[PDB]
Amino acid sequence: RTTDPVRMYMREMGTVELLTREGEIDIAKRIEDGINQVQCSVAEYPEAITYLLEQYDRVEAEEARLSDLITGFVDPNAENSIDPELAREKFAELRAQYVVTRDTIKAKGRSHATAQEEILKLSEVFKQFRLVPKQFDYLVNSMRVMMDRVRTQERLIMKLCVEQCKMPKKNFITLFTGNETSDTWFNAAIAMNKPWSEKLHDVSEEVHRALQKLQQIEEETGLTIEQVKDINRRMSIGEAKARRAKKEMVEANLRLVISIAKKYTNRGLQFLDLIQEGNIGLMKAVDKFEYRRGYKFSTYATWWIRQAITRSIADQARTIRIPVHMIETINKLNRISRQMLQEMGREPTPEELAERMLMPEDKIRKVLKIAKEPISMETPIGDDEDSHLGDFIEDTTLELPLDSATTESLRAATHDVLAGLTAREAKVLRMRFGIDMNTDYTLEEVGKQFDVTRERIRQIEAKALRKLRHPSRSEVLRSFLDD
Amino acid sequence: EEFDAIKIALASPDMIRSWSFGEVKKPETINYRTFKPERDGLFCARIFGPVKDYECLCGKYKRLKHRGVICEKCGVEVTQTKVRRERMGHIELASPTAHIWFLKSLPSRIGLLLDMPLRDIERVLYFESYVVIEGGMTNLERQQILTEEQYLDALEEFGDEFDAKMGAEAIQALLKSMDLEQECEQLREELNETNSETKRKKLTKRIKLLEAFVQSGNKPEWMILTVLPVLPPDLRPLVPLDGGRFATSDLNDLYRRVINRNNRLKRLLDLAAPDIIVRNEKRMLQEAVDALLDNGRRGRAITGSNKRPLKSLADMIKGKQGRFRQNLLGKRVDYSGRSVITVGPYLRLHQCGLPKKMALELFKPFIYGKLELRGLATTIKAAKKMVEREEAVVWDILDEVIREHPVLLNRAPTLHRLGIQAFEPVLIEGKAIQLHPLVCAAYNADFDGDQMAVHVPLTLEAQLEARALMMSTNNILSPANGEPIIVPSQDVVLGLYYMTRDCVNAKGEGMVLTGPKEAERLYRSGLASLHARVKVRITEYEKDANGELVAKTSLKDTTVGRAILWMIVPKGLPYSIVNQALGKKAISKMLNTCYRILGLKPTVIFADQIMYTGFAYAARSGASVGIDDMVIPEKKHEIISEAEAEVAEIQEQFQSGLVTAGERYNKVIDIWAAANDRVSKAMMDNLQTETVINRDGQEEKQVSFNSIYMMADSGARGSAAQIRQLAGMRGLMAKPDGSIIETPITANFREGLNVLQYFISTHGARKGLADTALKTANSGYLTRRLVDVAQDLVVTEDDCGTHEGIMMTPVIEGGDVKEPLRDRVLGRVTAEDVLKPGTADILVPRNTLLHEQWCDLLEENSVDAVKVRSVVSCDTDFGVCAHCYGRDLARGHIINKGEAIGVIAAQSIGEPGTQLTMSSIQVKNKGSIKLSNVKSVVNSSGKLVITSRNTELKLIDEFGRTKESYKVPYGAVLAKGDGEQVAGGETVANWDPHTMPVITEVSGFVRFTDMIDGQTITRQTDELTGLSSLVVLDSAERTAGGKDLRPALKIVDAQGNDVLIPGTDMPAQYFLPGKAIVQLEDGVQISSGDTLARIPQGLPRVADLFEARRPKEPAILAEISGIVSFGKETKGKRRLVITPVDGSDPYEEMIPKWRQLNVFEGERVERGDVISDGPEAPHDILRLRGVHAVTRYIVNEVQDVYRLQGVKINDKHIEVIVRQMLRKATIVNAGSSDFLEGEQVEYSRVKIANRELEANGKVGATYSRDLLGITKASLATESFISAASFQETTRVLTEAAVAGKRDELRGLKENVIVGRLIPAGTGYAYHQDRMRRRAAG
Ligand SMILES: [Mg+2]
């Protein structure tokens, strides 16, 4: 009755084993080949072939770049510090292939051997450019989404046509999907005969109205219909190729993952967290790898997953997040602490250690304000289980009732004082400080409200201080002087 | 604020959407340096609320220019704060994981419903095996598991037409599938097809869950979690310290945990993984979820570097630790204090020592209002300044406050209502609290390091409640008993004893007085003895007239102390009570007479003066005690040497090999204990009456001069035992084994121990001290459960108009009176008109207050039994009439409505139990004899022998009310009869205490028949004499050829007939079991009453008694009247062919005939007749008998357990809880509701008080009556909150929520914790006003 999923998962992964040294590179081959045939699929789609020089002129049209996107782009590998000379070189042949391509795809259409061998070398000059990152996903999404439109169209049309006519479907299968543009399929079905074909009403408008949106996607796309269903299938296969291929390899090296794991299982955190994460960094390490480098893949994914885990522990693993500059500084400290302790034989001072670490005690101490973690309210600082620490604290945030009474007595005595004043005086002195109000009216507006005056207000103010200050009304304050 | 009632329900997901203010999105909370709430983390003010007044974080919007202007940069509010304790955020989940309380706990509530095993579902939900969501084809079946590899078979076979997955997705769907109604009618239907027991209850169970979800509208899919709340920070906070050091709660971890996992869930789910990792991840997730609800439930708990578990959400509600027992029902308090304590000997009742600073700081705002009023301190700053300035006026002002301002006195452990009190303040220049010492007797307190706490009645209501209710003048007795609780404890008693004292010795003998004033003058002149019988005159008074004193006067020869003492006395009494040495029992009853006759205040003030004068004349009396007051006799060494040369006798006897150890052991301890007794007697005769002092004569002897005896005689302290220990040997000693030591003690503390004697003294001392260190836990535990039961109960009504209840008869049995029926009755009220032995002399019209005039009027009468309207026979729904209760004792009159009761018995019963754990029949005197329920016979002696076991003996007096009572065995032998008279001291009965007689009442021949050697029996002819009979073996030893054949030697005549039972055609022969060996052979004859054969041979108790605890070993009984034969031949147990007269025979049950039977294989019983031997269970009694018998049994049992220890409580208390155990009765018939189900017998009585009324002749159902264990009786409650407070809480809460239930706050516990007023007593009137408001809309 083992509920521990440790046992479960380790059993379930012990299921699988590893293979080596050519099934590995066979999977690489399979992957890259299916990818090259999705690349072929890209080099198809005539007016969408040319999503190379368009976006390439795009990244070029800002007069010079080597930055993020071009560091994504071509990046050809060698069985570069980008020199823009070759960039400028490669905006001349591409346009040439374009113009000579748009000339021939209309000459009789698309069945002409030299034309499609020119499209083959077009696909080749396309294929000298690697299947570089994000930008082409879009370009595939461009082709991915439109698929999900014709898949829309058909699925609509079927429901309208199939559910009715009289006979179930099969003639519809063989008829509509071929023609789908004129009503000649109808007369082709009626090639057989019958008296029940002579009656057709009440759906004639719906068929060609539904059709009316069909050709609209042609201008959206600019292609035949057959080649669509060709390239959909072709590319999907070139994808699924690699999509499968690695799950052999992913499941292959798992024992290595754990093996290198229990290097860094230095008790700071929990298993499945770290396990999951190592699998994750491994996902990349698989996604990225070059066998032609000819090395052991262990080394590759070791680098990758080391990084992944080394940063994920630092991100997580505390109550407070602590960015990494602190972290690396802290690890330096932890190592040279021990080094300098061997040197000294003793604890080092911030003095000579600031010297050796080559920077002042400022940062030392600035760090040492950080080095602590929290200590969990509910601990028993009551040794007998009598008072856990949380029970000691008072909240010194709200207020004290005696002081509320104090300030209320203040406010009421000021009401009493101000009650003995001239109307203009106390109204000025109220609204000008927002006493009694949510407001605090001030200088200019009064002129713009009352009339003008500003300075004689000040003069009034001082004389009011005169008549009130004289220690006859100043005593309801004189103990709030002590406030 | 005000609201009517509460409710539980199932929170929809959109309910939480409604509750929530924003969704949470990260694990972070703050910066490292700018200790700041981060957005979208934990403490994001944007969703939970702001710190300060009108300050967005970047300060963009400010000072009400931009009032309701969320600062768009930081997205932060502006408006007012204090919602970081209110607002709960939320989180939307990726996928559904389940709640656990509706899964893991007993009966599972979820798969419980689904009629599926748990482990199956585990295999689904540990993601191990797929399972049929739905068999698209019925080729396969819903609720059918497919392993993930056999699933492949099912799959590649078909692929399409099945639904089978592995997860809550598979399951919510199932819930989302399944339709309730059809299932419900189906179970209802096919129950009636086969409604066998387990089947039927299971069908009922599922129908209940069904119709519950129907009519609730609560829903099955709501078990499972797709959105999750998040709490306000202030319940889960994080703060710093003065050191810059930070401190957090557990839960902020766990919230944090899940975030990242859900992040790593969704993060992965961007990335198209194998399912295996997803399974693993989901496991991590729902594991964290469990950990939230319970760290350590499903498995190995979870810790930080603490190495200790993280506290559950649940743990906040739990044990004591949660809100209930720590923070809600017990509370810290403002305006209270404490201090060390001491005595005020001078003081009076209402007074109390008070170190003044205490009241000073505690009465501050009185003084500040008062100084503003005087305007010396015009306002309060200066008031406190002047306070620091220490002006005399303050103190006057302080006194000027303190007058008439009562106050509360508090000691713990508080075991009953009297352990705290309410006094009036008195100020003092010390830091030790002086008080009226006697009430230590109430508090069980002593001035040896005790200390106490104090509280204030600020409000006038409290002020006056104090002055009126727990004013001590309003509280002088127990409610347990009519006992004066202010017994003069230790010294006053003794000084008074010494005073009222009749030497002959001192001087001034035989003179005469006018009155005690000159007695003072005369002794005080130094002429006289305060202890000397001499003549004086008195003038005593009596209220013989209409409560109207009737004066008179005459002389007495009395001691001088007593004359003096009369001066205190308030003029309504004789001299006879004061006519003696006045042991403290006399004081008890004396003060008793005072309030019996005058009432309170005379007795009060009288007692105060008695305390005073006791101090006075005891401090005069002169006293000390020393080495020579401790005295040893001389006749000790010789008894010692004598028995010493006899222990050596039996020593040499064992050396020769004669006696055993146990013989030797018992007899040696007998002689040593006898020597102890002789030593005690010697010193008693040598110290009690030894002194030879002459006085106008040769020699004279009277009350001792040792100084020790009258310490015990006063009752102040001590008794013969302790004094024996000081003087003589102090009994024997034991190692904690429980064994008994052989060589006793010789020395005492006057002489001095051996090494070994003290070494040994160690042991039982340690033992019993350990016991003393632990019986309080069980005590508090039990008493706590007792209050936990009976919180509901309060009087409601004057008279329930009910029909009769209990009968009262004294409990005298086996000795003299143990409870006078007088004492039973007093303050009760009759069930019934009640006449006298003078017939038809009714004096109650079914109910009078049975005060002591009535009781005397009785005790005249020879009446010996009477009925009383019982608390049980009361029928008030949800409370009682005061009549079925009668009187409040320490009131001393009829109970008024409104005061709650169950608590009262609880304090009565729990408090004392702390102290509590630590042949022949011979007539005594003459008297009438009363035996009945009798079959017996003139035996072959001519005397009397029982032939119906029912009967037992009594010695009835010549009158008719009993003297003695003793059990009498079936067929034991007598020397007497019933309806006769006999001399005292006369062995009337005898029997072999080994034999259970097989006596033949018949007279008929013996012939060996039905029985053959070594088939049913053995033949074992006695080697010595020669006579024997066919010798019956036990169940096992006989041979199996006739072991199924009941052996029975048969009674015949000269012809061979069956000598039928005299009076009935039933044959008479004995299917003889083991040990029924007969001695005389074939052809022989027996007599009437002739044995053919013979048959040769505390605290946890009561804990079980009230618990509804139940034995294993019943002296099993007759289910139904009529004849019986025995049954199947022992496939583990024999069975029992019962046969009613007119009923139905077939009932028969497994019997271990290994243990002895009462009735035999051809012998008849009436119902209610024991069949085996042993203890028995209560449920058997209810199930068969009436009630009065039952309750009467148990009360007798446990009252004896008390009284054993010399313990005194009225029976009324114990009646009470009975009706609280009885809150449920199981149904018999049907037609109203479900068939049998236990339900409120109250509400049963309601519905039949509507429905079986001409609503219907009958639609509804008759009903059984039931019983419950006490804790689960507490659980079985309409409310859940009292049920939820303390034990098995989680489960109750779940069960409460599933039906979306609610409560109405009628039990007091319910209305406490909300801060409302009590539904009783003081708030009775208010809350009934509110009641009629609820009645009036
Ligand atoms: Mg004490």
Ligand SMILES: [Zn+2]
């Ligand atoms: Zn701001």
Ligand SMILES: [Zn+2]
């Ligand atoms: Zn009643």
